[PDB]
Amino acid sequence: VLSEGEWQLVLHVWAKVEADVAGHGQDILIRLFKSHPETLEKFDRFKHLKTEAEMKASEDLKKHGVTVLTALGAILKKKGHHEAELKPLAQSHATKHKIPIKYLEFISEAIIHVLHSRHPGDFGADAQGAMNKALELFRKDIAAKYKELGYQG
Numbered sequence: 001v002l003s004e005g006e007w008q009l010v011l012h013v014w015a016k017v018e019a020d021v022a023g024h025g026q027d028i029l030i031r032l033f034k035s036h037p038e039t040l041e042k043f044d045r046f047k048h049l050k051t052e053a054e055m056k057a058s059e060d061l062k063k064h065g066v067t068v069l070t071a072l073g074a075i076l077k078k079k080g081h082h083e084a085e086l087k088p089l090a091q092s093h094a095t096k097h098k099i100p101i102k103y104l105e106f107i108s109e110a111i112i113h114v115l116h117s118r119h120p121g122d123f124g125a126d127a128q129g130a131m132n133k134a135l136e137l138f139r140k141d142i143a144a145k146y147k148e149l150g151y152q153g
């Protein structure tokens with residue numbers, strides 16, 4: 001588990017994201033698509049976008065970013081007690097979108113990257129360490145459901 005003190009750092013950084021969900025969501029999906037171009041092929045919805053400028057201009061992409069971050073906010077707020085919220089996502093990600101586990105590791109890193117970019121001086125080492133743990137917990141739990149269904153990875 002994460003300690004009560006680590007969960008506090010996590011939820012404290014999350015309050016910063018909640019101040020501007022749409023902006024954070026956009027920077028995160030952009031960062032993921034430019035850094036690991038293979039991820040963009042999984043989205044029939046966004047596969048037409050080519051440059052950073054075009055990505056930035058998509059209202060649909062901004063809308064989807066809010067959706068993703070709201071789902072992840074829900075999860076974090078359960079402080080590890082997130083089975084009901086996590087099972088459905090794993091199932092969809094595994095069996096419908098066909099997303100490999102390693103891509104989840106990629107969006108995790110894009111999340112930490114944005115947080116450093118955006119709040120250079122607030123988001124310190126200790127908070128970074130807490131966030132990392134929280135994201136690994138999420139990945140561990142998903143992978144367990146993926147193995148169950150036979151998509152391990």
Ligand code: HEM
Binds near residue numbers: 072093
């Ligand atoms: C923080 C990790 C993630 C969260 C919370 C998340 C959450 C969501 C949610 C809530 C949806 C819409 C409902 C659903 O179908 O599940 C969604 C859709 C989708 N997700 Fe994720 N996702 C995550 C990571 C990823 C990654 C890393 C990829 C691919 C690289 C991916 C691919 C997609 C696709 C293809 C869809 C359908 C998009 C569309 O056509 O509307 N997801 N995701």
Ligand SMILES: [C-]#N
Binds near residue numbers: 068
């Ligand atoms: C999912 N994005």
